[PDB]
Amino acid sequence: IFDGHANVVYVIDTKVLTKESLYGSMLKATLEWRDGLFTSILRRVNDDITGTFKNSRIWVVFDSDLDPEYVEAMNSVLDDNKILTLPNGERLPIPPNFRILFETDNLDHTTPATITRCGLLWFSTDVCSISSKIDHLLNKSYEALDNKLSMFELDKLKDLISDSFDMASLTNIFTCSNDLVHILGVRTFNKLETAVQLAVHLISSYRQWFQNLDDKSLKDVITLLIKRSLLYALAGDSTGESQRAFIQTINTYFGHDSQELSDYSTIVIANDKLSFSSFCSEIPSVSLEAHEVMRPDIVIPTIDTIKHEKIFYDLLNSKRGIILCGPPGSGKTMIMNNALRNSSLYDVVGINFSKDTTTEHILSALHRHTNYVTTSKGLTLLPKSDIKNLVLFCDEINLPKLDKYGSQNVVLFLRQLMEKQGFWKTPENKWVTIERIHIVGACNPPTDPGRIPMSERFTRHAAILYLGYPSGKSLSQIYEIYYKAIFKLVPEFRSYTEPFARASVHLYNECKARYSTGLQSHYLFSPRELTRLVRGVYTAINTGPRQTLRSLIRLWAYEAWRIFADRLVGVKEKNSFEQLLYETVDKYLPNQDLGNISSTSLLFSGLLSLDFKEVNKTDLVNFIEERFKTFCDEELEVPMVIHESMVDHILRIDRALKQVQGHMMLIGASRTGKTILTRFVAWLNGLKIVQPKIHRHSNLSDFDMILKKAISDCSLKESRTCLIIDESNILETAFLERMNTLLANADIPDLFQGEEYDKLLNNLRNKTRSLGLLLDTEQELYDWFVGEIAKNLHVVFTICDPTNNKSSAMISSPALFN
Amino acid sequence: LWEDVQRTFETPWCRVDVLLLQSDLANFLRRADELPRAVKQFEMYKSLFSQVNMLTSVNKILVELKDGALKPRHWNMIFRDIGKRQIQKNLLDKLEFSLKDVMVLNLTLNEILLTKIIERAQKEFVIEKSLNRIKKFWKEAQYEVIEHSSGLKLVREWDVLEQACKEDLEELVSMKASNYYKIFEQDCLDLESKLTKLSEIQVNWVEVQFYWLDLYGILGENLDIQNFLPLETSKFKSLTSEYKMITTRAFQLDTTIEVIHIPNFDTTLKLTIDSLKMIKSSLSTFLERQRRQFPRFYFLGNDDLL
Ligand SMILES: Nc1ncnc2c1ncn2[C@@H]1O[C@H](COP(=O)(O)OP(=O)(O)O)[C@@H](O)[C@H]1O
């Protein structure tokens, strides 16, 4: 404005775009030099004169943190000679009108020579007050909503908003908020924007009911809403009881003249009455079916469940990126899935981030539900495909590892998507704007080993929500529902549902308390363990015959052993768990008819009969001996000995293999028979065994085609294979991440394209038609392939001592433990 | 009904498939109960039921034998060792022999010999399938070429097909170790020769394209150096013409594997690459001579001085 010179701006994120994409590169077939973004825009500005550049000022900013290598091609540009030094072709001159910017916060990987050559500007403090920031945010929201909504109602609501909260008490609120423990916390100056955006959006959501009520009640409800929004945005990372403390705090400091904010406060607005008061204690009952024990799309309503559902839905409707925090057993992924799939406005894209997930993988994931359209405002676009909003669920954002100079590149890519609402097309070298594709993610606290602390930029731009273990009582009701569903099979003991759930919850709490990482770093217990054991009980009952009370208690205890104690070391810990089960049963069960309940005194297997039941020791020993004799007859002849411990391990492996997910972690020491006992048990059920063949130069491709052919055999012909993977087999990190993905997910996310995708599609066609199945829905074909691979694949891990660093990485991996 | 059964036996070995056979046997079993009592009292029902139950018993062995593993030599030795009989060699080569001749071998009792024969056939089939891949893969898989300054047809993204041929060699040389693969040993060696000639052809095409485009940015457009090296420029132009003829021949050939079948091809590639190397050496000598003619040129570098 001062000079009347036009402004030219180009925002580029460094770590997102590599050198051959930023500056271009020669082709290693004809040395044809590709342009690259920076060189292309420089060419457009300099060579082309149709655009106005003599009169204008051209400005280029590198928002992402910069490394010397990128400016190693710019140091000459940074030097006083003022000429671009291309690896090939002529050297592009640069005019004084072509200014260059760099923006960052870390100077560890910057040469002092660059500091000398550049002009350094430092910000040692905040640039604005809290109140001024808030006022600017309200002005931004007002101008964002004015061009869409009615102006008079906007005037009324914005006047009431300005006269609703005063900065004086807000200062006390924020100061006390700083005096509170946060998880991945950032300063309140960052969460201000989230709070104000959420508040303004949600108050705009109730526009239709703002004309027929008294202005006093409107002020009351607006204060209620602003209090709720400040609570949820500011303290969304709080423990939850500290959330109650902050509720009381803001109730005290903020004006009491309006309707007061409560813990479980909500408004059920309906066009029948002026329903705007506080509503609470509205949990509904849900009746389910027996077979619905394991469908990963099952959630049970609780007060915390519905509250988190509503908050997440509100903030997605607030159009803001959201990031989730919680313990590994907090249940984030599936509660999020249940919150998102049932929605009539949002589409699920569940993508699991890896140790390194390239950006074009995310680009393809978007392609599967988006398209490229060309308009005048943004030229090329990448908007939605259908009408419902598209939201991608990135998973474990802290899992990817930084580069050699720090910072995770595709994390900054996500920052680019959710900050500037678009990115740069690397071959097209033109900016593309997205149309409201929201970003959702979940990550464990960085206090968990193997999690990199997250950059404050990304956390600031999104909002944080922390959800922990839902107390002890809530687990009691949810597993009481699970147990009534599981007792639908056997109506004899319907009223005994409560004692089982109470005992299970108490046992889980005692397992958490007794065993911790102080002994070793895998004593983690989660409600996932309880869900697994209730599934085990369900499978045992469904496969087993009618059970008396004593039989039901015995099988419950056996599944408790197989879920909890099988990960325990020593015998002192084992007998401690044993006696723990004694007092748990005695407290939570009136029936005293069981005998010894120890591992040796429990012998439950379905290998000796069609029905899963307790069986004689001697008969099982004889059966195993006969099968081993058959092994010596036909299978590998090794001097082998049968004992009680290996028989117990055979029972455990058979139970694990009969599970729907035969993903097994077998941890011990070498020369113990594990890698051949697994073969023995696999042949007992007549499976197929594949062992990878590795070498000193075995790349990723070897395991790639071995795993692909194993998957195809499990799918094309339903071979029902079992996979044995050893510590020797794991040496690189590439197929490490491949195995982690195939475990956490169920399919291959990076090879099912092109000819592979087409052969998968036609193979599904052929198999469905041969089996007489009419299934032809492409997405449902993908889901059925997931089901087939889940139903037919079982992988077991044979590992050396956990003290090994590779073994430590194996046991400490999130998916492998999960 | 019995006519359908006799038709199924008389249908040739290649003309019967396990899925169609299973469907036909299911139809026979379903329609067996629909026969009136008079037919069942007659010997037709007895014969048909015995034959269909017999075929049901030998369903799995037929599934094992119906894979692509088995070659006519395997069936020849099956008939010689088991049935002590032979089928006309012309009919045996095309795999057209009645299922009755298959069944008179008593597949159930002699299942072990057929099982080991099928095992050897599958050991050879592991090789055979990989053979088929290259067979049809490189059959076409031509090199995508474009136009540069109205000149030669330079291949685009050629490194991917280069690597494809390289891995095809790796797999062809690794499949040479097998228990039952001595059938196509002459074919295997023929494929090895074809792909080795192609490998040398490719490792020289990469070099000749590289050097030809290097010197093409040096000669052919700027007449100053062309006059400075008249003999070298003339040699480069002649090599350009002959290599243009070679590229046109190989590109309208439209068959990558058949490229070796063009006579005086590898020799042309060898002489071309040797002449290009000599031309580049002479050019470097001229560059060094000019640099000695003017000491300050050593700062400018090769590209700037050119
Ligand atoms: N409200 C709920 N409804 C159903 N299951 C729940 C609920 N809360 C917790 N769970 C159980 O607790 C377990 C914890 O899951 P978790 O391992 O935290 O998933 P992730 O870490 O992938 O988000 C889940 O397996 C789930 O079955």
Ligand SMILES: Nc1ncnc2c1ncn2[C@@H]1O[C@H](COP(=O)(O)OP(=O)(O)O)[C@@H](O)[C@H]1O
């Ligand atoms: N229960 C057992 N009785 C006898 N020998 C055993 C037993 N368990 C393991 N072995 C010995 O271990 C070898 C088999 O290797 P294995 O123990 O399966 O390796 P790892 O336990 O490291 O996977 C055999 O040579 C055998 O002598």
